[PDB]
Amino acid sequence: DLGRKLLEAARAGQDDEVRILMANGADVNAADNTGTTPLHLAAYSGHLEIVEVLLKHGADVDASDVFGYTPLHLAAYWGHLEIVEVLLKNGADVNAMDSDGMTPLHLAAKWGYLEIVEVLLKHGAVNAQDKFGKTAFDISIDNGNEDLAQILAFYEILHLPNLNEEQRNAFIQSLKDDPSQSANLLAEAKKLNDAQA
Fold this sequence. Notes:
Elements: H1 2-12, H2 15-23, H3 38-45, H4 48-56, H5 71-77, H6 81-89, H7 104-110, H8 114-122, H9 136-142, H10 146-158, H11 165-177, H12 182-195
Helix pairs in contact: 1-2, 1-3, 3-4, 3-5, 4-6, 5-6, 5-7, 6-8, 7-8, 7-9, 8-10, 9-10, 10-11, 10-12, 11-12
Family: Belongs to the immunoglobulin-binding protein SpA family.
Protein name: Immunoglobulin G-binding protein A
Subunit structure: Interacts with host TNFRSF1A; this interaction leads to the stimulation of both surface expression and shedding of TNFRSF1A.
């Protein structure tokens, strides 16, 4: 049973066993009844090289399990920066949502992965609300993570349509003087954004 062997080797990080299983015609996109594929297990376990091989042989980069998790979800949840970069480089939907409406940005913000949040925003990650109506910034505020709230408020302020350059740079400079106030400045910015619309 080559599919099961490929799933086991993908989860255990056995690179040469994955190569040999591929050489015998194992299905790159073999999924168990939960919808979990070898790319899922390699992105979850943190095996970058197996991610690169699987993607090289045609692994579905946007395969979702019965919970709605894509491999990008798993890489963001478990803090695998380089696997996030590799999956995005191979066309992963940066805005994929799970059963709870959560994007990889939500899961990366949940654990305070600053670099993964940066990489996701570089690839055009969108600000979305989960089932609880919460954004990645809200998650940043529920936790005591000042840096993450500062970055996410930087991006929210950066993308407001009705602020002019002097106001936007004033809010950004106000995000570098005291980051503890990142939650208040964004609200001030949003009020101004809606007064000039």
